[PDB]
């Protein structure tokens, strides 16, 4: 009956293997069962119970509000470009009104940011549909597609420069809409794990924010020995990791309340949502 | 994507291999990894079923593949005397053991070999043998004795044993009584056609394990004392066990495994001069 690690996810995606350089070089890994997948993988299991603490999608974590408690100063996001989440399309935005487009399965978020974003933005209503995420079949038998992780930043830097597709970056056509940035996934601890182990819960959430501190510190030897096993190069790695924005304070609470608002309605969710964060100590 | 991937690497759950693990994360080595944790049978099935190109194998299963498979010199999960994590639990002498039921823990290949090659062998006793998912009070219920490995046979030498006064005989210690030498339970091994197809990286992982290995000895008892807060084990059982463990494999640890393998092989299922393959270094 002794005392058992806290079972955590983990992003499999380069976006977050800086964070598990510092989760291995601080040692913290050592007090996780950690487990690595896929961002909607990571979040069923959090949401059913065979997680304690994990990243979470963030229109999941809005599904899931009432149950869950997200970690302050640390989500997976950006100011203007994201890099990793796109749009690649073979036909200006605007010409997809009708047009078959491909939702990459392993999205949630996303997929309905590029939906707001084509409705309400270009005005466009495609006919979407889920499927596997593969951009050379998606290109295939849809028009457009909406990728994320590794295989959207492998079609933005190297697949649509090369067939001459056009890939939007759905962290920048937020920010021209909005001038906001934008949230993709938060942490998380399940309120009924955080409310029983109010500790446990703290000190894996300050682990994530050293080991975080750390891969901010360390990015570039950590682009370095990614670099030798990805088909992009150190320095395009190096930019991705810089690039992206790893806060989650006012601002970053703020656009997510923004999104929040705006595709409650059409999500599942009450546009107002209450995000709960994990509270320090007095 | 036609880009180099890392290699895939098995990696023991138990506390046996925690220090390496912390070696291999305070490293770094960790992100030249495709980590697969699991027990030491899964591991090996993996490898040999061709689920991983590199990791630790039991002893038996290594060699019933060796011709399949590339051991890495100086480091293995081994022993000289006793070993902690390998037992029988009895609630008998062992020399009344002969007609008598004995559980065999079904996570273990090598271990419960050893336990009846020395119960056969060196104590002249047959018991009725049978197999059984690990768990003490189970095999205690039905069983005059049980071999088992990993946490649950330091559970039962630390804890369990003291407790309900049961015997716990160190598997490790049994074999060094009876032929003054230490044992091996696991090595580490690629995959022969991994290691042919990428010599390099089949290298720099060796290398990088025997690192890791290396720092792992070096802070021993930070591991200890973080690992404490996890397990009904304290700081220092933890530490002497860690520090018991032997995890070289050079000439006196394989003149070990030649003389296991030549006392099994026949009635285990590889030649008794089975020819253990070791990763060259490079000149
Ligand atoms: C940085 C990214 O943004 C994400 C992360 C996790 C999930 C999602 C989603 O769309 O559900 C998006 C990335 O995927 O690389
Ligand atoms: C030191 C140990 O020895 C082992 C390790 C792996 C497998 C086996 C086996 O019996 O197959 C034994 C331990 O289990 O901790």
Redesign the interface.
């Known amino acids: 009956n002794?005392?058992?690690?806290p079972r955590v996810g983990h992003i499999q995606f380069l976006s977050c293997?800086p964070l598990?350089?510092g989760?291995?070089?601080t040692?913290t890994?050592?007090?996780f069962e950690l487990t690595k997948d896929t961002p909607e993988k990571l979040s069923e299991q959090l949401v059913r119970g065979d997680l304690d603490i994990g990243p979470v999608t963030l229109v999941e974590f809005l599904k899931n509000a009432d149950d869950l408690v997200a970690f302050p100063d640390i989500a997976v996001g950006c100011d203007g470009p994201v890099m990793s989440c796109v749009i690649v399309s073979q036909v200006p935005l605007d010409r997809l009104d009708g047009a078959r487009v491909a939702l990459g399965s392993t999205s949630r978020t996303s997929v309905r940011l590029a939906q707001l974003l084509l409705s309400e933005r270009f005005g466009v209503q495609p006919d979407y549909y889920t499927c596997p995420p593969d951009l050379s079949l998606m290109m295939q038998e849809a028009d457009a597609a909406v990728l994320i992780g590794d295989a959207a930043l492998?079609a933005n830097m190297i697949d649509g420069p090369r067939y001459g597709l056009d890939v939007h970056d759905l962290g920048a056509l937020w920010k021209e809409w909005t001038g906001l940035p934008f949230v993709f996934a938060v942490w998380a601890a399940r309120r009924d794990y955080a409310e029983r182990e109010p500790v446990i819960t703290r000190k894996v959430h300050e682990a994530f924010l050293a080991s975080r501190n750390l891969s901010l510190e360390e990015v570039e030897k950590?682009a370095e020995?990614?670099a030798?096993?990805?088909?992009f190069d150190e320095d395009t790695l190096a930019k991705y990791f810089t690039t992206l924005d790893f806060r989650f304070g006012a601002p970053q609470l703020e656009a997510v309340t923004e999104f929040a608002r705006r595709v409650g309605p059409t999500t599942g969710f009450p546009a107002d949502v209450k995000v709960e964060l994990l509270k320090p100590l007095e």
């Open positions: 002794s005392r058992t690690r293997l598990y350089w989760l291995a070089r040692g890994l050592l007090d492998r950590v020995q990614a030798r096993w990805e088909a």
